Design a protein around this nucleic acid. Structure first.
Ligand SMILES: [Cl-]
Ligand SMILES: [Cl-]
Ligand SMILES: [Cl-]
Ligand SMILES: [Cl-]
Ligand SMILES: [Mn+2]
Ligand SMILES: [Mn+2]
Ligand SMILES: [Mn+2]
Ligand SMILES: [Mn+2]
Ligand SMILES: [Mn+2]
Ligand SMILES: [Mn+2]
Ligand SMILES: [Mn+2]
Ligand SMILES: [Mn+2]
Ligand SMILES: [Mn+2]
Ligand SMILES: [Mn+2]
Ligand SMILES: [Mn+2]
Ligand SMILES: [Mn+2]
Ligand SMILES: [Mn+2]
Ligand SMILES: [Mn+2]
Lengths: 122, 102, 135, 128, 122, 128, 102, 135
DNA sequence: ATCAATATCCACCTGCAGATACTACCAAAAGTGTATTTGGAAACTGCTCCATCAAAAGGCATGTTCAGCTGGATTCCAGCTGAACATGCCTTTTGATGGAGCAGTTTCCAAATACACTTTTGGTAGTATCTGCAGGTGGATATTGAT
DNA sequence: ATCAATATCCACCTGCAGATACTACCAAAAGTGTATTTGGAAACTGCTCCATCAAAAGGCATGTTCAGCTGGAATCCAGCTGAACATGCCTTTTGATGGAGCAGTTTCCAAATACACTTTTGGTAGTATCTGCAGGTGGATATTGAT
């Protein structure tokens, strides 16, 4: 019917008062991860292969590390050129600077293909 | 269950709080342990003076990472060193570690 | 000949030229001729077996509690009253062992460069200096 | 045109920018993280799309090789060891991750040649 | 019907003149540096010593480099702590992480002094 | 004689922030650079003062040492060589600039002992 | 006129006469320049094979730095490689150079 | 007690002397053939003199034009028709020379580690592997 | 020890690349006034997980013996590499002209940001039940090493 | 090469920590709609500085001769360091409990952002004088290396 406005925002567990089902101890702040996406990709490439939680923690670190490396390089690129906007062009150049040979080549191809598709809609 | 004191850390009174003096724990890094690390490193023969040399190098390595991790801990006004404090310290020293968050 | 009858000459007779081979050293035969027996692998054989074993595995090689006390002792010297998440200690141990293993790989290259198979403190020192950890 | 009122939904409503870009990785999240990290005052619409596509691509590459390592070791579940074998045995990923440690990864089996036994190990004049 | 109000040794006047812009601001794209401030400090430490242009450029690079490292470290610190503000506290901690022992102690002592003075300042 | 808030006379740039901080380095410029560097959403007022002070202090440390080097070389003008000598002979500056190249700086005089005349024997008593 | 085999006369060994446009180039980094570099590096004796080895290493270094500098040049839509393009390329390769940021 | 013995005029380094002939003789070999043990520094003496000379100076050691050519050639492989600011080329030369000099210092430590004073390709290779350039 | 052959250093001298002092001009850098927004410290406390205890036991550390074979020291000498020369190729300089193209300025619009709603979704929590593989056994096959 | 002592391989198996499976809830995440602002691409072009010549002038690379002294091969052997063993302890494991302290939720103002307006200043430009020191000359004297 209606949720907003306030208060509550960040509810769960206040003193006691509970109807049924014991759960949600003063809402934990959500810690996001790439796990569901890493899992989706894994199934595309190796349909019957699973991954342990420790290996998934490694994959999450890998994605976050590359994200930060590419974004940092793009940031520097934009500043060096006195631009206040990071566009797909800064991402592309950051990718060429950061990735070794064949990886950068295939990464640039996939990135370009994705932007072209994205802009082909609407 | 939420009673005590704190301030300077932890403690009780009726005889209950530990913490014996820590010293010479670098000797806990044993000859067999160092031999195992050297083996994984592909080393087949080891001079007798290698063990104390390795302890000295590990101590420097640990002092450096721990110094930065604790600096992150203190800046955040915490009294507990987190895995994240270690990961950030490792990263800033060019020893990026995956598997522990971040 | 001697024209008589004896069948002595030649055929093993005359003198010796036959009563050959080694005398002992089979399984024991304590009559003297081959020392003892307990089994021993040669120096280096087990070391090579351990390299193969440890390069195939991933488990930490330093004992956990002893490493944890070293971490606490060092930290304590920097700042009193610290507590540690247990994963903070495991992170330090994972990093420390990977650092040492990689350094032993560089140290071994240095020993080998000097025509040795035995690593020595000077090999560690040379690797750390080239790495920029020392000079 | 001029506010007023609108009707109908063809653009999407239920269409994510990820579906629109043909991606599995989240374009919306990548866009928000780029803005939250203070990389620039502005972030164009195509930047998170390109970045998500690249992250997805690298993830696929490491998982492809890692699943191969798990298969090679007769395992169906990828563990840190398989990720480390995938990375260190691949020239380009090894370089990309040259200063990264994969926890519980171990190292690649590798014994320097000069350390292996031989010459039947029996001097030259029958001795030691 | 003209008497050649101006000879032919360059260009003539265009009606009225400019008391600004066109005056000399075009190729004036300001390129700032720490040179005049580095110069002032040299005078306080070595009144009778000069510095070559090449040496001054090394100094400009130096100050720019340290600024970037300290600011970058301060940036990560604030981000790690989920803070949108870089305060003197982040600068201080960044200094402690970046500078070697004694250098850090004196840098911290100088920073703390300037902020105190500045504070107790009209 | 009254007024109020002081927001009146001397409405001009009274004192620069650098002057108020007792600094020679430009606090306002440092503030502006922090803001345009995209280091964080906001920048507190004391941050550029603390940072300007650190930058000035480090500059003074190196200029002091390079000036001493120029002086030891019979010169009154600091050139790149003197900055290099100053940094490399200083344990802490050397470490801070461990991955920096000072153009036209050259290297410190240093000959490995084993290379000195008569098989191998460092010797020397002048600077050794 | 063949003449000589090394010494006096004319046309004898050591008589080339062109200037690049596809010739030395990496071979233009001479044995004497490499020896000088080594001397500044404290080297007293040099193997005959060091020269080609050094050329190979120097070419890899330049390929790496120039590749990134040109990447910055192209991103800027420029046709001229600037000192800043080189300074930025050097910095990201962990070889920060001071003196060229004007 | 005399004046003779010498009577070696007052000045003049001329050999032909006070009577015809005016060659370029002095005190060496006015003929054409030998010399009588000319002067020679021992192997290593001049190398050491050069190390001291070059460690005292800061001038670039590779010739400018040949270096510029190398740079342009390498760049042409990544993008044709480029121009270079003069300071771009100088920045590359300052960086390249600093890199090589520091590498030779490391290479030298590797040679000495192997009990040699002569640097060899394996010393450069070891240094680059430890640095992580080859590795 | 003697002393020639050179290298190396100090005192002085001077042209000049390059630093310096003075004036002129201006966009933007910077500071001040005031009005609004808001990050994040206080204060209070839910709820995680860190420190610490307990007890048992076996994996693994320690300490020792024995000797294989490695490192260290020595000796010898082939031949590589340094030093010294004689040429003479080709870099260096400097002087000075085209013109590429960096870089300054004016337009102008595609796309970014800001704001208000609404639907969607990933993460967290409670509960339960599978499933891949570590760890163990037992026998067969391979590796190592003595003869 | 034969034989024996052990390691190593693999099939087979079972326990179970970790993995995986549905139901439930929701606060932030994400998308759609309109409106408003503006970063920077496009076109033009001024003038900085890069590329090419021209062209001597000689610093410096290259080829050659000779042999000093280095690298490394060949030997010997003291004793380090690996292998195997007995012993027994302390790490690991399993389970538990207090409570330190990390972190969720709301309040609240010091301090930051947002702007308009005035003032101040560092950078660009000319035009012009000054000066530290590089490079050169003498001549002393230190170093090297043969006798
Ligand atoms: Cl974009
Ligand atoms: Cl040693
Ligand atoms: Cl502040
Ligand atoms: Cl070699
Ligand atoms: Mn202590
Ligand atoms: Mn708030
Ligand atoms: Mn015991
Ligand atoms: Mn013996
Ligand atoms: Mn040996
Ligand atoms: Mn044009
Ligand atoms: Mn869902
Ligand atoms: Mn198994
Ligand atoms: Mn605009
Ligand atoms: Mn000979
Ligand atoms: Mn030798
Ligand atoms: Mn409490
Ligand atoms: Mn001014
Ligand atoms: Mn001079």
């Amino acid at each position: 019917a209606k949720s907003a406005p306030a208060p509550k925002k960040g509810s769960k567990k206040a003193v006691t008062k509970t109807q049924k089902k014991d759960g949600k101890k003063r809402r934990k702040t959500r810690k996001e991860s790439y796990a569901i996406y890493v899992y989706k990709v894994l199934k595309q490439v190796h349909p019957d292969t699973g991954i342990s939680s420790k290996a998934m923690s490694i994959m999450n670190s890998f994605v976050n590390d590359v994200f930060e490396r590419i974004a940092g390089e793009a940031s520097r690129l934009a500043h060096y050129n006195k631009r206040s906007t990071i566009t797909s062009r800064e991402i592309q150049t950051a990718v060429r600077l950061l990735l070794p040979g064949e990886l950068a080549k295939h990464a640039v191809s996939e990135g370009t293909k994705a932007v072209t598709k994205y802009t082909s809609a609407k | 269950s939420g009673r005590g004191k704190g301030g300077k850390g932890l403690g009780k009174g009726g005889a209950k709080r530990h913490r014996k003096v820590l010293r010479d724990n670098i000797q806990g890094i044993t000859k067999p342990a160092i031999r195992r690390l050297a083996r994984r490193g592909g080393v087949k023969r080891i001079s007798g003076l290698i063990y104390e040399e390795t302890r000295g190098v590990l101590k420097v390595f640990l002092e450096n990472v721990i110094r930065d991790a604790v600096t992150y801990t203190e800046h955040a006004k915490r009294k507990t060193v987190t895995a994240m404090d270690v990961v950030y310290a490792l990263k800033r020293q060019g020893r990026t570690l995956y598997g522990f968050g971040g | 000949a001697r024209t008589k009858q004896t069948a002595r000459k030649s055929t093993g007779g005359k003198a010796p030229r036959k009563q050959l081979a080694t005398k002992a050293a089979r399984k024991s035969a304590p009559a003297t001729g081959g020392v003892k027996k307990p089994h021993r692998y040669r120096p280096g054989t087990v070391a090579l077996r351990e390299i193969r074993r440890y390069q195939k595995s991933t488990e930490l090689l330093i004992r956990k509690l002893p490493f944890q006390r070293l971490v606490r002792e060092i930290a304590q010297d920097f700042k009193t009253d610290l507590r540690f998440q247990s994963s903070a200690v495991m992170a330090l141990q994972e990093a420390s062992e990977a650092y040492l293993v990689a350094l032993f790989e560089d140290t071994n290259l240095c020993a080998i460069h000097a025509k040795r198979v035995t690593i020595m403190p000077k090999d560690i020192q040379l690797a750390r200096r080239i790495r920029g950890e020392r000079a | 045109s001029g506010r007023g009122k609108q009707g109908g939904k063809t653009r999407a409503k239920a269409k994510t920018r990820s579906s629109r870009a043909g991606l599995q990785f989240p374009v919306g999240r990548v866009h928000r993280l780029l803005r939250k990290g203070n990389y620039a005052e502005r972030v164009g619409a195509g930047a998170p799309v390109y970045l998500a596509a690249v992250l997805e691509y690298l993830t696929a590459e490491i998982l492809e090789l890692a699943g191969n390592a798990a298969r090679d070791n007769k395992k169906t579940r990828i563990i840190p060891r398989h990720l480390q074998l995938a990375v260190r045995n691949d020239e380009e990923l090894n370089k990309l991750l040259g200063r990264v440690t994969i926890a519980q990864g171990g190292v690649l089996p590798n014994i320097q040649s000069v350390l292996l036994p031989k010459k039947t190990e029996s001097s030259k004049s029958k001795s030691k």
